[PDB]
RNA sequence: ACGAAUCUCUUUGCCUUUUGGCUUAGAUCAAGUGUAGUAUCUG
RNA sequence: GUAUGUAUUUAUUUUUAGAUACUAACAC
């Protein structure tokens, strides 16, 4: 067989590349092993060339000599991909390996901090009981500081439109928004991406 | 204003993911009005996806759970991976 | 984070400490790429 | 179990046509050279007009039969599987290939 | 036999295909369990 | 209506008639060959080639720097 | 029911802007052929060829 | 036909010595596609790469002399000249670049391929070049004036490997249509065709003496007499596929590089395989990356140089102990074909 | 009784209209707005 | 303040109100 399996196998190539950019492992549920050897080979090759082009263009921009308008954008893209790959690598290796610090060093550290915080006779910061004197003020500050990002904008995006909208309601009912806020502080331990 | 999920919209989303794949969400919110990408993708990963585990909890599931929740102070993304479950189900 | 929770326990009530500690474990998304953040600090949080 | 190499298959088809031919001969029994020019090397072979027409009719007939049977598999093929959602015929057919891949 | 190739990214002809054509084992490390334990102990020692 | 499935045989170009345009890079150049012949104590503490691009050391140096 | 009907409409069509255009343009061309043919048949019915 | 099989049991061929691994040289960033050796002094290599460079390694110590950049894409082939101080490199960028070894700078560019050019061979006595690639034609370049003097239409697919010979057929070529053509250039048409290969003929080599060629394919490495164009011999090969390269020592040893990483050495006379090795991949490599892209022998023929897909060059030396104590290889059993 | 042929149906084999490229996922993301030409829904 | 594309054969070859609408180099 040729052409059917031609187009199919080359599609598998492209898909394996995309999955290599995305750091997704790319197993095909079934597929003859030797072909998988080959495609893994070529995609490793293309990967190395791609990375090396990213380094080279970056160190060409650091000197700042005739880089095209787009090459800056594209190079940025390749660098962010690479950086996230380094991150995920570090995290996985921490799972397999286990935490770096060691129990000894950790115990010493915690002891140090405790010794200090007694040396300074420090009181652990309480939780902000309602009827806190400054609650409404600290609200006003925080809400203003979020508001300012929007304020110096000629035109506003919908997500931005939402961000500015949520605060405005916020002004109307501080007491409720405090209830919700502190309720989140207690209940919610799982957050959005 | 932020909406909850009718079975209509939910179904349309499932058929959409079936056609367009996971990664094109902004095309999923094209079909589905009143909703955003982040909302779509968010729900598909959190709830709708069939690969997710919604099931009863064995006597071992609970033991392993309590074990982890004691071992790892609050981190419910990590633990969720350890249990292969959506997080807020685990919490 | 195992350490952070404890060193924040010293300074702050365990509620806020646990909160902050959990807030740093979140799925991070760029386009396709996504990964849980299992280890380091996220410097973009307002209280980072 | 299993596949068949393009040789064995070729042999089998040859045998099949031999049987068919032998049956034409028996039923025909029931109902009842080489010259090369000196000028050019062109060879000429005496032929019976019968059996040549019988040959053409055999080929045409078998082509008709094959075309028809495949056509019926066309018909049933699309009418059998209505389970999953499909936009067009070609989709349904592709997904039946995915059923073959299992 | 080469399987069919079905991608998350592109579906150019508009073929709609089953979710399962679209769509971990290892346990947590030993070292982390020890590290968490020491702190639970250290605080207890600290408390006294 | 996309990709190559083949390449163009030079054989075709071999049968065409020449145009005779004069290019810049075929102007004569290199026209001749060459032939060969107490304070210290009080403190709390203190008293290789992988083949791959991403997991090398230079790379983690690189991204460790340019990403700040 | 409206957005569901519309979803049902978009999910069933993969034609594309160029492809839809070439289908309909081919329809136009075939129509033109049919027209010229039946012209010639009518003029033939009057004897002019 | 048994008579032939008896006549295979009389000969008991040609003892040789085994090979082993002398030296490993890392230092390319990408794969190593091609290798050629200074035909006079044996002082160095020029090695292509998949990173576009070419790195001139010293043969003696393995140190790196210099780097020649200048191609924008991978370099499929490199060939150094005898009579001239020139180095012709050629790549996937559609271009055949000359190199003046004296000043180490590109002298000439030859132009006119439609697409990537995978082979250069330097005609021994004529001051010509022969280039070929996915064009599916062989271009005979006049070295001085950069004029593609002759074009050889022929193979129905890409052309992998090309060689040059002083007498008739002056160009031998091998293509993915699974043929090997023996060309007559003056008339500009095929003198002889050799069709016996079943799939793409991906490698050839000229015997430095006997005036014959060794052709390869997936599983079957044959030989061919030039002149008449007869078959000469076959070589015993079970599946070794894929054979990327061949090289012929002056002692009548025929090397065969595998894509499975196996190094299959043969006697050239017989067809017998006296040794098979397996390379070690590398520290962090993949089991897929173990293969042999190119190879050659020095002018002596007592060393072997193989570029591998693991980004390393390896230098294989012939054992001096050997003899009959325990050399003996697979020991000549001619199975039925 | 089995050998032989035609028609019909089921199972296996063969795949038949059964996803044809690269780049920074190639980039981006909604009430959007007034009026106007023309289609048509009801008493 | 649309590339671009198609066609442009004349001179005679032997036998009752409006709602939902689509769109508009037309008005921020």
Curated annotation (Swiss-Prot), chain B:
<protein>
    <recommendedName>
        <fullName>Pre-mRNA-splicing factor CEF1</fullName>
    </recommendedName>
</protein>
<comment type="function">
    <text>Involved in pre-mRNA splicing and cell cycle control. Required for the binding of the NTC complex (or PRP19-associated complex) components to the spliceosome to mediate conformational rearrangement or to stabilize the structure of the spliceosome after U4 snRNA dissociation, which leads to spliceosome maturation. Its absence leads to an arrest of the cell cycle, possibly due to the inefficient splicing of TUB1.</text>
</comment>
<comment type="subunit">
    <text>Belongs to the NTC complex (or PRP19-associated complex), composed of at least CEF1, CLF1, ISY1, NTC20, SNT309, SYF1, SYF2, and PRP19.</text>
</comment>
<feature type="domain" description="HTH myb-type 1">
    <location>
        <begin position="1"/>
        <end position="52"/>
    </location>
</feature>
<comment type="similarity">
    <text>Belongs to the CEF1 family.</text>
</comment>
<feature type="DNA-binding region" description="H-T-H motif">
    <location>
        <begin position="76"/>
        <end position="91"/>
    </location>
</feature>
<feature type="DNA-binding region" description="H-T-H motif">
    <location>
        <begin position="25"/>
        <end position="48"/>
    </location>
</feature>
<feature type="domain" description="HTH myb-type 2">
    <location>
        <begin position="55"/>
        <end position="91"/>
    </location>
</feature>
Curated annotation (Swiss-Prot), chain C:
<comment type="function">
    <text>Functions as a scaffold that mediates the ordered assembly of spliceosomal proteins and snRNAs. Required for association of BRR2 with the spliceosomal U5 snRNP, and the subsequent assembly of the U4/U6-U5 tri-snRNP complex. Functions as a scaffold that positions spliceosomal U2, U5 and U6 snRNAs at splice sites on pre-mRNA substrates, so that splicing can occur. Interacts with both the 5' and the 3' splice site, as well as the branch region. Has a role in branch site-3' splice site selection. Associates with the branch site-3' splice 3'-exon region. Also has a role in cell cycle.</text>
</comment>
<protein>
    <recommendedName>
        <fullName>Pre-mRNA-splicing factor 8</fullName>
    </recommendedName>
</protein>
<comment type="subunit">
    <text>Component of the U4/U6-U5 tri-snRNP complex composed of the U4, U6 and U5 snRNAs and at least PRP3, PRP4, PRP6, PRP8, PRP18, PRP31, PRP38, SNU13, SNU23, SNU66, SNU114, SPP381, SMB1, SMD1, SMD2, SMD3, SMX2, SMX3, LSM2, LSM3, LSM4, LSM5, LSM6, LSM7, LSM8, BRR2 and DIB1.</text>
</comment>
From Swiss-Prot, chain D:
<comment type="function">
    <text>Involved in pre-mRNA splicing and cell cycle control. As a component of the NTC complex (or PRP19-associated complex), associates to the spliceosome to mediate conformational rearrangement or to stabilize the structure of the spliceosome after U4 snRNA dissociation, which leads to spliceosome maturation. The cell cycle arrest of SYF2 defective cells may be due to the inefficient splicing of TUB1.</text>
</comment>
<comment type="subunit">
    <text>Belongs to the NTC complex (or PRP19-associated complex), composed of at least CEF1, CLF1, ISY1, NTC20, SNT309, SYF1, SYF2, and PRP19.</text>
</comment>
<comment type="similarity">
    <text>Belongs to the SYF2 family.</text>
</comment>
<protein>
    <recommendedName>
        <fullName>Pre-mRNA-splicing factor SYF2</fullName>
    </recommendedName>
</protein>
<feature type="compositionally biased region" description="Polar residues">
    <location>
        <begin position="20"/>
        <end position="32"/>
    </location>
</feature>
UniProtKB/Swiss-Prot annotation, chain F:
<comment type="similarity">
    <text>Belongs to the CWC15 family.</text>
</comment>
<dbReference type="InterPro" id="IPR006973">
    <property type="entry name" value="Cwf_Cwc_15"/>
</dbReference>
<dbReference type="Pfam" id="PF04889">
    <property type="entry name" value="Cwf_Cwc_15"/>
</dbReference>
<protein>
    <recommendedName>
        <fullName>Pre-mRNA-splicing factor CWC15</fullName>
    </recommendedName>
</protein>
<feature type="region of interest" description="Disordered">
    <location>
        <begin position="1"/>
        <end position="16"/>
    </location>
</feature>
<comment type="subunit">
    <text>Belongs to the CWC complex (or CEF1-associated complex), a spliceosome sub-complex reminiscent of a late-stage spliceosome composed of the U2, U5 and U6 snRNAs and at least BUD13, BRR2, CDC40, CEF1, CLF1, CUS1, CWC2, CWC15, CWC21, CWC22, CWC23, CWC24, CWC25, CWC27, ECM2, HSH155, IST3, ISY1, LEA1, MSL1, NTC20, PRP8, PRP9, PRP11, PRP19, PRP21, PRP22, PRP45, PRP46, SLU7, SMB1, SMD1, SMD2, SMD3, SMX2, SMX3, SNT309, SNU114, SPP2, SYF1, SYF2, RSE1 and YJU2.</text>
</comment>
<comment type="function">
    <text>Involved in pre-mRNA splicing.</text>
</comment>
């Amino acid at each position: 067989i040729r052409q059917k399996k031609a187009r199919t196998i080359l599609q598998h190539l492209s898909e394996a590349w995309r999955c290599w950019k995305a750091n997704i492992p790319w197993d095909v549920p079934g597929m003859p092993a030797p072909i998988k050897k080959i495609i893994e080979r070529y995609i490793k090759s293309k990967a190395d060339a791609w990375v090396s082009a990213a380094h080279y263009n970056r160190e060409r921009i650091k000197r700042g000599a005739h880089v095209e308008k787009t090459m800056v954008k594209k190079n940025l893209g390749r660098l962010t991909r690479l950086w996230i790959k380094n991150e995920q690598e570090r995290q996985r290796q921490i799972q397999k390996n286990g935490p770096e610090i060691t129990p000894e060093e950790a115990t010493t550290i915690f002891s140090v901090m405790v010794e200090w915080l007694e040396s300074r006779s420090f009181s652990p910061i309480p939780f902000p009981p309602l009827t806190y004197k400054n609650d409404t003020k600290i609200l006003v500050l925080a809400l203003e500081d979020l508001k300012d990002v929007y304020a110096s904008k000629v035109r506003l995006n919908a997500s931005e439109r939402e961000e500015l909208a949520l605060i405005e309601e916020a002004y109307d009912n501080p007491h409720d928004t405090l209830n919700r806020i502190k309720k989140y502080l207690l209940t919610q331990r799982v957050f959005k991406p | 204003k932020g909406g909850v999920w009718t079975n209509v919209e939910d179904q349309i989303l499932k058929a959409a993911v079936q056609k367009y794949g996971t990664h094109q969400w902004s095309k999923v919110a094209s079909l589905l009005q009143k909703k955003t990408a982040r909302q779509s993708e968010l729900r598909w990963n959190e709830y709708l996806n069939p690969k997710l585990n919604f099931t009863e909890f064995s006597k071992e599931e609970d033991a392993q759970l309590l074990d982890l929740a004691r071992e790892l102070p609050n981190q419910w993304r990590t633990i969720a991976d350890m249990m292969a479950r959506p997080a807020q189900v685990c919490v | 984070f195992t350490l952070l929770n404890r060193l924040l326990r010293l300074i702050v009530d365990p509620n806020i400490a646990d909160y902050i500690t959990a807030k740093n474990n979140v799925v991070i998304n760029f386009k396709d790429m996504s990964h849980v953040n299992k280890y380091g600090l996220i410097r973009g949080l307002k209280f980072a | 179990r299993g596949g068949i190499s393009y040789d064995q298959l070729a042999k089998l088809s040859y045998e099949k046509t031999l049987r068919n031919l032998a049956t034409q001969t028996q039923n025909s029994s029931k109902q009842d050279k080489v010259q090369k020019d000196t000028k050019t090397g062109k060879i000429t072979i005496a032929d019976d007009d019968k059996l040549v027409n019988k040959l053409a009719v055999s080929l045409q007939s078998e082509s008709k039969k094959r075309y028809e049977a495949r056509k019926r598999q066309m018909q049933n093929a699309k009418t059998l599987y209505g389970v999953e959602s499909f936009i067009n015929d070609k989709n349904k057919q592709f997904n039946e290939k995915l059923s073959r891949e299992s | 036999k080469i399987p069919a190739a079905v991608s998350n990214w592109k579906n150019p002809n508009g073929y709609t295909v089953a979710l399962e054509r679209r769509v971990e084992n290892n346990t947590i490390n030993d070292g982390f369990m020890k590290l968490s334990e020491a702190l639970e102990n250290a605080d207890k020692k600290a408390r006294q | 209506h996309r990709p190559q499935l083949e390449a163009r045989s030079g054989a075709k170009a071999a049968a065409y008639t020449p145009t005779g345009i004069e290019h810049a890079r075929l102007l004569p150049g290199h026209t001749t060959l060459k032939y060969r012949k107490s304070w210290r104590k009080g403190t709390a503490f203190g008293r290789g080639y992988i083949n791959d691009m991403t997991k090398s050391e230079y790379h983690q140096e690189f991204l460790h720097k340019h990403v700040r | 029911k409206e957005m569901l009907a519309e979803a049902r409409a978009r999910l069933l069509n993969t034609q594309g802007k160029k492809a839809t255009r070439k289908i309909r343009e081919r329809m136009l061309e075939e129509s033109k052929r049919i027209a010229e043919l039946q012209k010639r048949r009518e003029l033939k019915q009057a004897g002019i060829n | 036909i048994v008579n032939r099989y008896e006549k295979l049991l009389s000969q008991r061929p040609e003892w040789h010595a085994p090979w082993k691994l002398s030296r490993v040289i890392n230092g390319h960033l990408g794969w190593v596609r091609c290798v050629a050796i200074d035909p006079v002094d044996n002082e160095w290599f020029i090695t292509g790469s998949n990173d576009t460079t070419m790195k001139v390694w010293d043969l003696a110590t393995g140190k790196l002399k210099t780097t020649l950049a200048g191609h924008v894409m991978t370099v499929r082939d490199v060939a150094v000249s005898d009579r001239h101080p020139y180095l012709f490199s050629v790549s996937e960028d559609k271009t055949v670049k000359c190199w003046d070894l004296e000043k180490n700078q590109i002298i000439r560019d030859y132009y006119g391929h439609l697409s990537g050019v995978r082979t250069v061979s330097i005609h021994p006595t004529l001051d010509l070049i022969a280039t070929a690639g996915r064009d599916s034609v062989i271009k005979l370049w006049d070295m001085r004036t950069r004029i593609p003097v002759i074009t050889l239409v022929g193979h129905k697919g890409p052309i992998n490997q090309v060689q040059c010979t002083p007498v008739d057929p002056q160009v031998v070529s091998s293509s993915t249509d699974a043929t090997v053509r023996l060309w007559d250039v003056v008339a500009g048409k095929t003198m002889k065709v050799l069709t016996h290969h079943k799939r793409s003929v991906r490698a050839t080599a000229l015997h430095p003496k006997e005036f014959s060629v060794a052709s390869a394919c997936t599983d079957d490495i044959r030989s061919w007499g030039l002149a008449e164009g007869s078959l000469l011999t076959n070589f015993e090969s079970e599946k070794t596929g894929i054979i990327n390269t061949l090289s012929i020592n002056q002692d009548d040893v025929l090397f065969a590089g595998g894509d499975n990483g196996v190094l299959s050495f043969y006697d050239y006379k017989s067809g017998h395989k006296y040794q098979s090795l397996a390379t070690r991949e590398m520290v962090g490599s993949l089991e897929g990356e173990r293969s042999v892209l190119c190879s050659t022998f020095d002018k002596t023929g007592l060393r072997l140089i193989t570029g591998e897909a693991d980004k390393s060059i390896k230098i294989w030396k012939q054992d001096e102990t050997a003899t009959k104590e325990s050399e003996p290889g697979l020991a000549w059993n001619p199975n039925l074909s």
